Design a protein around this ligand. Structure first.
Ligand code: HEC
Length: 103
């Protein structure tokens, strides 16, 4: 996806609850550094719900694309209160940015 477009999407819809940089602070949600290739709920020092921690899947392009379309559907009981990015293209660009900004 388009990294530049994904960045603006992140700033507009995710930034209020997330940071992505290495050593980033946890806000409403956990810092996202190192997300790809890691199982759900593994950000150091963040208090996740049992649901996010128990999902047991590995975050990557395919799981992030599904999750971001409807967070609560993928992880019922999650405390991430966000409806999701409905457009696939917008979601793909966001994932592209996430991959670039989190490593
Ligand atoms: C606050 C109102 C939020 C907004 C807007 C977004 N997210 Fe979030 N996110 C939030 C919380 C409180 C949590 C933890 C949920 C829990 O049940 O513990 C999360 C979690 C995520 C995750 C999973 C992280 C992990 O498993 O380590 C991802 C990948 C994530 N959030 C992504 C994300 C994106 C890309 C957003 C914008 C579209 C976004 N979130 C917004 C709270 C909030």
């Amino acid at each position: 996806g388009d990294v530049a477009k994904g960045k603006k999407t992140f700033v507009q819809k995710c930034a209020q609850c997330h940071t992505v940089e290495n050593g980033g602070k946890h806000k409403v949600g956990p810092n996202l550094w190192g997300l790809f290739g890691r199982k759900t709920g593994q950000a150091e020092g963040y208090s996740y719900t049992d649901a996010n921690k128990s999902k047991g899947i590995v975050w990557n392009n395919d799981t992030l694309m599904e999750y971001l379309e409807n967070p609560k559907k993928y992880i019922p009981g999650t405390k991430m209160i966000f409806a999701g990015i409905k457009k696939k293209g917008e979601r793909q660009d966001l994932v592209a940015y996430l991959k670039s900004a989190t490593s």
